[PDB]
Design a protein around this ligand. Structure first.
Ligand SMILES: [Cl-]
Ligand SMILES: [Cl-]
Ligand code: NA
Length: 129
């Protein structure tokens, strides 16, 4: 599914991401926009052999099992395919474990390089929330 900006904002809000660990909703929407262009089916393979999955581009070396990333750790205890669903629940649940890990949202390269330190509230401007 390719989300609209406000539709995803609303879905993330319902799943408890607004101010989760201090990160306002705009941060989460910005990170999804630059990680996947709001497409739940996005995949990108990395040079280390791991692959990033879904709306928030969660990586198979640490967080999910895709059966082809050797010595990977499934800390979210989920097949990576679960992260490509039109229902974002699995993605949100796994993201909450990632952002709690120590480095906050710096775990997402697209967030750190394109969202961090920008006016992230712009991403939820206009939305009924
Ligand atoms: Cl915000
Ligand atoms: Cl980047
Ligand atoms: Na893994």
């Amino acid at each position: 599914k390719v989300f609209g900006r406000c539709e995803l904002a609303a879905a993330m809000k319902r799943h408890g991401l607004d101010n989760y660990r201090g990160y306002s909703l705009g941060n989460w929407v910005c990170a999804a926009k630059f990680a996947s262009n709001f497409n739940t089916q996005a995949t990108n393979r990395n040079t280390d052999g791991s692959t990033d999955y879904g709306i928030l581009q969660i990586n198979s070396r640490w967080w999910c099992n895709d059966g082809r990333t050797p010595g990977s750790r499934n800390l979210c205890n989920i097949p990576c395919s679960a992260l490509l669903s039109s229902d974002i629940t699995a993605s949100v649940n796994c993201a909450k474990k990632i952002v709690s890990d120590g480095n906050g949202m710096n775990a997402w390269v697209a967030w750190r390089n394109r969202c961090k330190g920008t006016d992230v509230q712009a991403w939820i401007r206009g939305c009924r929330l």
